[PDB]
């Protein structure tokens, strides 16, 4: 069965990173699913803990690691042993009266602030991820734009040339720190606070640095108030995913207004466009506009985890509002989608350079050579070039069509005098690709100094890369390790006991 | 005069810090007038560069220096020339049409941007210096309480013994992290975006790097575009203070309800409390509630500076939020007014230790105690010591006179079976400054955990001064160079040429 | 399986609304899912519509309405079919290109704006009998508390005494007045925005008001545009939950200290509480904290709604942020849970006596009482009591061990002169409940004024009931209608034609 | 000296309306400043009534109302008499200890919470105000604009022909709600909380309707506690202010758009655009974007004030968020902008005309006619015309240029099959004119129906007008019903006793 949405000029599919907008609400996970599976990993974990501890006997240890298993297998579609108290009943029902021993020295509060830092901990690693090829593809795209003249706005009114490139790479240094960001966060999310138990510890004589790496932690949440208390870095994951998408909804909406029937400098890939149902000539940025949807709706997990903190003490609290599934899911769906949207958008460079060249945004080359040469105050010539242009317009004449009579009338108009000029010296101020050239210190869109940036950016990428790895594979490791332990307790008991 | 609110319980005058709330308001500054003085740093900074870079002559330099002083003392009393077109044309009533030979290469945008970045990063050192003697006063307040026992509470109920040292150290691990947060966003405030003129850079051959050194930037704002339509700095700063805020407003709730007529365990000092012009009995905790204010306020900025982001392509905007100084002033008058209160605090350690020993916040020790020794599962120990309370609350037993027989009752009632346990094994589970020492692991209330907590707070507030230090000395530094390049420029220009 | 959660002191069962709180997030629709009911309403109305207006005949009707009630049993378990396109291609394989011909007239842009608001609208209607039971049960509370003397707290400290029906019927003045709120955004929500089609209308002659009113609209959204664009009624509905919500939050606060171990007030009924894994005693608000979490998130789809609509222009657009069923779900869930809460709610009725007699809230009658009397201005008056309640404490006298002795020598150690007041005088002016009789006007604790209000606010919840009753009719009587004209168009072409 | 911003093209001056929105930050009173002559009226008609009441002798309230009038001048330059307690005690030093016994049955709290009100309401009639002259200004535009064809746009992208004054109507419709939801709100702040003194009421026998009346209000905030804890219509009015001012937003981005560069559908007048330093051919849209800023901040004192409610019991609490006057008079500096904006916005007819003709729009109305016509399904014609459009853009074909032979081999080449229509029935169809007049039901552009919206516009702004004077009015009598009860107490005193 076709995709019904695909006529007229929605030909092809969607995209998948298209597709994937559309996909993410029905499909997200709530809290509880998300979180359960790293709860599992949890009570192995402390059960290694407690049997290194000699608080468990392996035998003890084994049997309630096999039970494990076994109940993390019925909760597979018994959606009521997702939660830890069910859970442990089943354990209970599964193993006898041993399974309550895999508690000592724990509380439902350690427990969930840790799963649910395992949980963010993955979903960072995975936001990480998408930033980078996002970056990726920004970067990539402006590598084949170094020549893609095209105007820069401010206020939503063209203000001076620049290139493709020189804009992608804006997007590249915003990414950069927003990836810094993450990473920040990240140090702050991998702290293991089980050992709090439910907010002052134990007499049990836990070994917290050990759970801590057995779980993949970096670090301990030290303070044991601050390991149930602690809901900061939930806060924090909240506004860096706002932050980051309001960066994405800024590139979404230039690409929008690009992308209008008039500016038509840019054109969306049939594969990120929809249609009308009514209206046959419409191609939708329904791609943009879902990713921007994505950004505002990121608003809302920021304000809800913010203010139940302003309204508790500073203890565990079942009040406070969580970052939920959903809602990174959609980050990540409005990020590969904007990903797609950049790597395969469709400049139209000749459009981009009749702007350049015809509305004016060159004006301020000629007012700078006015300056340089003729050496007359910013302020003297600013007028006469704004006259030139009033005139222009009033004529008709489009600023590639500016002589050297024009700009003597406004010249002699504004200030009785003539200029000592000539027509090529405002021929070549007002050739937009020369004032891409002039324009070539640091960060400034002329191709040498684009790809410079596109050249640092590459290198911060493989650093981006390399961090990534490093984290990721921590993680792959602890797993591995905890893994192990448990089929070692396990198998032991087995055979030789 | 004296201060009228200052009457019946209300006894001596506001502490300092609780005046602070009340002055906070009236005192602010506007954006305009809190960032010009540092446009006038960034005119000198510019013009040095271009005098540098030979887009100047020293005489030309010397003119428009010498200037700026002039229209600067102008400014003092004149508000209109606190913005830059304004401010430029007083220069040229004051030195001549070389005033405007200033602006060369430079635009309103990326002067804005980089004023206000100047502007935030003064505040971002004053905001870490409250936040570190909030944190040295809760450290400092920690250390003179590690017998303190009291209890502590989740969900607003009681749960556990610890102390007040145990409970202040929770805060300082808060601080610390927040601490990270304003030093990670120094790193991104203080980045120079001036060259970027328009959004575009210029022809101009601006020296970059000797602008942002002059004014004490660690490093440049590359992009062009990103150096004026960057604004997430902004958006962060605004996160960070409030989710610092929310963490204030939850100690300020914790005291609140410790001096709640009720609960009794601890007084605001005279200092820091109001009274009613109509009750008598009133000791109001004015200073607790207008901080909290203070953390509720400073979620609309954060969310007013993001949906504005989330309202514009990634250009310069006029239409962008700012982060306002009498929104940074608010938060630092709240910062000082709770660290004061938390200096200040009585609490009362006779009240504190009742509640420990009386209000059953002791049964999970009397529960790992059974389990521990007797060897029965945590969760039948626990439907016990659970009846245990139950008939203690309906016969009105304390729990520091639950005794023997009452265990024994529960123990048979619920399973048939007694329990090998002595009144001595009872009496110390039920000893709640033994259910502290207990506590000894990594963050737990045990004094000996707590002092180590202390000892490592110590040295990263050490740690915490010492990069304040640099900061502020880095800015200083600049500053005199700065000062000093100016009168060099001017005094040569007079007196051998 | 029993409920795992209820061991120890959290005996029984959780109450249904209680229960409510942990299932409404799981069972919560998608938007997509809660709306797509409502399309297949839209496509009869807008059918029988077109056959009215002849641009249907009666055959090409009955095809067409005959296989819609096809599609929509393929879209009971065909989830693809839940969005317009994908169902009206069903729609084609079920009855031919006819199929096509019930969107004459019309667009995806107006069937979406009016069936999100016929979601809207039943989700009113549900929220409103929600509301009205809330007030409901806090009315019928207080009437049986009028004589439940009791004190008032302002800033968490204890204020003057007062009675807990005085305290119950200050909440049913908030309901009362968000249920107009909720009244007066239905009259908003109840606008017919179709045959607007796109945003432009159409050239077919459709009959718009004969649409809205089959299908149970009140009026109509008239411009075209605003049919499309309007989306002010989205933002209020969450507002209005949102403020509402907030109302929710301060009693649930409100309780939860009430039932502190330490104020010991009010104790949650069994059924609302729970308890904790590892510390026997706890007594856990579960059902208060997840309500106020439930009014913290509300929050964030304010926050998203109208971040997108400060996004865009006054245009259709995808990028729109929505209110999304889960979010109505919860409001149900914690206005049912804090419905039972207090339906249920246990008050200590001597503690609330002891405290309201002891601790100091009937100083205020005792100033009034020398004012009255002595006639010594307010403010000397105050100093005196004030001294009274600081000597009483320092000496240990609670408020109703307070005599003449006292506040004569307050009077003689604050003025040199003491005050003619009998010790009845005193004792009288210290009596809480007399403190309550003397407070008589309207809205006052009295119990005559509280039995007046609970008087107003039953005639009021009749006239509340009677508006539900009436908009819910209003809606039956339109689907009925719309019911039988679409069994008359099919029943007959196969019959007489 | 003139404004420095009006350089090159930047001509003439800023409109008034304009300049506001550069004036209202630096000119916007603190909430102090802004309340305190509010609080002197309740003063005067409290005393009034304890006067009428017989709690006050005529020669005591005479006395007293003499010292008002004395402490209130005072005030005028002594910030320090702005809050209550030292206007008391400034009251005594003037006329002595009966100053005192105007606090008589009165707090702080109840007195606050009222002159807050009569602030609020003051600034509620000011907005509706302008609101008012806003619509006028929308409605009055539409008129002159009933022949300006032009395109409506879907997601930023031409969908169908419309005009001017079908989309100015769509403005007022949006203004009509919101105007509802301020007399809504006006209601619920109109309500008079003096009488509840702290919270609880008093023994003292005041008549609260007495003091109600006197003070402008509509009626009693009944019970005592939601007198003084009573916030919503804070909210509430924070919300009214953000959801409209999103809708003016989407007017200030519409119009935006529209005064592209490339859009050039409309222009500025010079007294609402400004000017680069640095870009002579910027006309920059400040006015716009500094009317969207104020929308984007007003989500702030929304979401603080939310969440401090969320934050506290249902009591008086000093943690509560206000909305501050500086947020009122940035929504009315945008309110009044925008007025002008839209009074003297120059739209392009030719260019707008053009862009209906050329770009497309109007192949709805050809697919409509295909279907009127020949009589095929809507989505068969859907796809021809697609292709017709598909074909029509790669060979240069603009919309009015498309003839039967391209309308020939779309449906060729799509079906086999040609169509039955004329040159003239295509024509017609691509007639964007006929597009508009053939839309001609409720709500649509067609003259005819734009013109009947405009009617009742302006019978509702009739209605508008006639609410705001008579509300103004009833203010105005109430405040002269006390001024002269007043003069009464004061000159009867003095002349015959
Ligand atoms: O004083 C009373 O009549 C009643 C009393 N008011 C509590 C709040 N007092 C301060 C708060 C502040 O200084 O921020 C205020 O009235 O502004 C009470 O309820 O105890
Ligand atoms: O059901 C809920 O929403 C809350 C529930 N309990 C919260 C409190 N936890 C225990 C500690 C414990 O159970 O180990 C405590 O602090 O009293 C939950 O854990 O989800
Ligand atoms: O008045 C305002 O709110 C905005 C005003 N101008 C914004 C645009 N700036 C120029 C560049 C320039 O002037 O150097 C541009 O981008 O067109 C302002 O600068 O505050």
Redesign the interface.
């Known amino acids: ?1 076709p995709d ?2 695909r ?3 929605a030909t092809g599919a969607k995209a998948p990173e298209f597709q994937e907008l559309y996909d993410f ?2 499909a997200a996970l ?3 699913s998300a979180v359960f599976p790293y709860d599992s990993q949890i009570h192995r974990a402390h059960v290694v803990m407690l049997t290194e501890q000699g608080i468990l006997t392996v035998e003890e240890s084994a049997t309630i690691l096999s039970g494990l298993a076994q109940v993390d297998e019925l909760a597979a579609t018994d ?2 042993l997702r939660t ?3 859970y ?2 089943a354990l ?1 029902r599964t193993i006898g ?5 895999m ?2 020295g ?4 350690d427990l969930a602030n840790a799963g649910k830092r395992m949980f963010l901990r993955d979903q960072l690693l995975r936001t990480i991820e998408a930033v980078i090829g996002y970056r990726e593809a920004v970067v990539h795209k402006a590598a084949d734009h170094l020549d893609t003249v095209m105007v ?11 290139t493709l490139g ?2 992608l ?6 990414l950069a ?2 990836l ?2 993450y990473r ?1 966060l990240y140090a ?1 999310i991998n702290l293991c606070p089980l ?12 070994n ?2 050990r759970t801590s790496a057995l779980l993949g932690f970096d670090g ?11 809901w ?1 870095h939930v ?2 994951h909240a ?1 860096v995913n ?2 980051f ?3 994405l ?3 979404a ?2 690409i ?2 690009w992308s ?5 400098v840019a054109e969306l890939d049939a594969s990120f466009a929809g ?12 791609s943009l ?2 990713s ?2 994505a ?27 969580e970052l939920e599934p959903r809602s990174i899911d959609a980050l990540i769906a409005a990020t590969h989608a904007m990903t797609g949207v950049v790597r395969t958008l469709h400049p139209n460079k000749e459009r981009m350079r009749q ?1 350049a060249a015809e ?3 060159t ?3 000629l ?2 050579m006015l ?1 340089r040469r003729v050496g ?5 010539a ?2 006469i ?6 005139t222009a317009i009033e004529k008709g004449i489009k ?1 590639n069509k500016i002589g050297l009579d024009l700009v003597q009338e406004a010249a002699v108009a504004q200030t009785g005098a003539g200029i000592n000029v000539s027509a090529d010296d405002i021929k070549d101020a007002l050739d937009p690709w020369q ?1 891409v050239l ?8 002329a191709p040498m100094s684009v790809k410079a ?1 596109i050249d ?1 950016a590459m290198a911060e990428l493989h650093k981006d890369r390399a961090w990534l790895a490093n984290a990721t594979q921590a993680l792959a490791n602890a797993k591995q390790t905890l893994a192990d332990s448990v089929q070692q307790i396990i198998q032991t008991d087995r055979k030789y006991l």
Do not use: C
Request: charged share 25%; proline share 4%; hydrophobic share 35%.
């Open positions: 069965v019904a949405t006529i007229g000029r609400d029905a709530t809290l509880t959606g009521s830890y108290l069910p442990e009943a209970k009266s041993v399974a309550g021993k508690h000592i724990r509380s439902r509060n820069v706005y401010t206020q939503r009114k063209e203000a001076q040339p620049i020189h804009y790479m804006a997007i590249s240094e915003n720190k927003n810094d960001r920040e702050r050992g709090a138990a439910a907010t002052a510890g134990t007499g049990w004589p836990l917290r640095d301990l949440v030290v303070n044991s108030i601050e390991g149930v208390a602690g900061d806060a924090e506004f706002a932050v998408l309001s960066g909804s800024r590139l909406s230039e929008q207004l209008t029937d008039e500016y038509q249609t009308s149902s009514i209206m046959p000539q419409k191609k939708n940025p329904d506009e879902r921007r949807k950004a505002f709706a990121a608003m809302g997990p920021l304000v809800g985890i913010l203010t139940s903190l302003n309204a508790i003490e500073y203890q565990y609290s079942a009040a406070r509002v702007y509305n004016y945004s004006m301020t080359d007012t700078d300056v007359i105050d910013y302020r003297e600013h007028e070039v704004a006259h030139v242009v009033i600023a004032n002039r324009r070539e210190g640091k960060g400034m869109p940036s640092d």
